[PDB]
Design a protein around this nucleic acid. Sequence first.
RNA 1: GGGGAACUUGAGUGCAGAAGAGGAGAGUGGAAUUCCACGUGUAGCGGUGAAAUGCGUAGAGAUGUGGAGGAACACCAGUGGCGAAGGCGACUCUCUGGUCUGUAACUGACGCUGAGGAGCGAAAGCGUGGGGAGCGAACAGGAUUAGAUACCCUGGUAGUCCACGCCGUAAACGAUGAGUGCUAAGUGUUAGGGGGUUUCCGCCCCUUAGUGCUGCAGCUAACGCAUUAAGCACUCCGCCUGGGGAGUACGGUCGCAAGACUGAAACUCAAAGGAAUUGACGGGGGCCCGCACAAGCGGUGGAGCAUGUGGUUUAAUUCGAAG
Lengths: 64, 114, 149
Amino acid sequence: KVCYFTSNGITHIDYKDVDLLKKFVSERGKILPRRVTGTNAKYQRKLTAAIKRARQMALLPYVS
Amino acid sequence: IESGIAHIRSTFNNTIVTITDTHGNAISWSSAGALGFRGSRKSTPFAAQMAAETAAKGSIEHGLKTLEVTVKGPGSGREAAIRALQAAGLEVTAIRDVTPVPHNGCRPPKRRRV
Amino acid sequence: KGPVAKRDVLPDPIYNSKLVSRLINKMMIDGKKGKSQTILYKSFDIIKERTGNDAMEVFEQALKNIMPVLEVKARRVGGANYQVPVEVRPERRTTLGLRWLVNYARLRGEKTMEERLANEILDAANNTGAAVKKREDTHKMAEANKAFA
RNA sequence: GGGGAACUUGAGUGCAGAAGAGGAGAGUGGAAUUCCACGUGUAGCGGUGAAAUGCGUAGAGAUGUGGAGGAACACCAGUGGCGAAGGCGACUCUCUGGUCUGUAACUGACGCUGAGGAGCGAAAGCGUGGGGAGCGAACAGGAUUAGAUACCCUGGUAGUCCACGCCGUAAACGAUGAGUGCUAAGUGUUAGGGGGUUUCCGCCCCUUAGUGCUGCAGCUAACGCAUUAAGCACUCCGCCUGGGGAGUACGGUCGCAAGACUGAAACUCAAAGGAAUUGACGGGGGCCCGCACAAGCGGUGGAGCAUGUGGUUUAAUUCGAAG
């Protein structure tokens, strides 16, 4: 139920910030769903965009 | 030859067992068909369990103690063989659920009822 | 439906051993009364003669020998009719083993019934008899098809 | 109706934001399947309700490497979003379409619909040139069957992909044409805007536009629809008038072809249909019962005879009975 981005009041991802992307991907590398992250619907799509970009850039593994 | 890796395929018709070295070098292998199961009986957990201890017996005489197991595919042999290993006196240090899960891969074969 | 059972051929309650349990009651599953309680009680004495010990002890020793502990029934699956191993209840054990002794006694064929039966009791006290033969064939069948649970 | 002068709500323009698998082009990347070479590696692997064809001692499958390629973009992913419809999901960039919100600065009725016409229009299909991993019509082999030109198994050509043209069909469906206005609520959810406590979070109240779910009046033959009407009304277009004969025949217009659009008739029937109602039935489901089955005993037919019946036989073999 808790919505991390609107709770801490932060704007768009700024994809370089690789620290929280770990918290938002599973240890397996699977991107966590809304049912567990509790984030807002509008922000989730730009999330998976950011994770996909950094994944292509090899900051996050495709599978761990 | 102290450590190795035991690989077992858990299919719906068979269950293979093979052991290898950390360098990916095989030592010995077994199977339900290797033991003498020919029909659908190869898919039973019992056949895979038997496979487990024949693999263990083919393993000990070369002197390997510690293992960790990779399981492939879904089947009834998932639970039988893994505990059959430690029933055979060996020590398996990890269980790895590695199966080929393509993102899209190739288009699967047709349905079974058309 | 539901489970059901009965007891009969009861010997006396107290100061009763198995030997006199049978010496006054029990078994006799061969036909109507008479030609049993007779053609029996004398089978035991001929083997008192044939063995230098209590003729009862060989009886339940041979019984222990004949007892199975697994067997197999038939189940309809697909088109194979798989043979499924199962266990045996404590009473199913006794009834079926006793049954094997009696029917093989009347199958084997010699001069007469009581010597037939006595010879089988000793051939099952020793582990070389016809009923015991079927016991190990059922057993090897069973754990040859052990896989099926 | 015609003409002249207003006006701004309809309809647009400008201004500030917002969202998106909207479209076209280029490049990029990850897991796999397959193939190949290589190390290790023994005896089967694969497969179905059992099996078999197949692949393996010429060393398979398995397992650790390295390549080669072509197809689709896992979770995110949600009765979510976009698009007029078909449809559109990996990433980046180039170009480019439409929509909503708040405005009130602008024009001042510039609007709706739309036969013919024009363009798009899934999949299969066709033509040319490439490409071909997997899948896979056709086809072969093995199973099942009385038969099996199929259902099942092992292969596998065309296609599936790419570039440019052609066909113009689909249950192209919400089986509901487009536009406008009005008519109880409740409840999710998507993109916003305003306000009340703070310009913290997050609490609530209004508010547009979507996108679902229940539900009044109303409509409905019944189902059911019900501000996303199948309600109340007005404009514009398309379509229907019993079932077959038949979307076939003929003649045209298209298409290279397959075929598509337009579309009779003779003859023939008194039904054909929609929804609901009650039973029956299912190789439908959920329960429960019975010497029903299992678990035991002894039997029937194999022989002789007793008796009844069918057939034949006679002059008659008296008639009745037939799971």
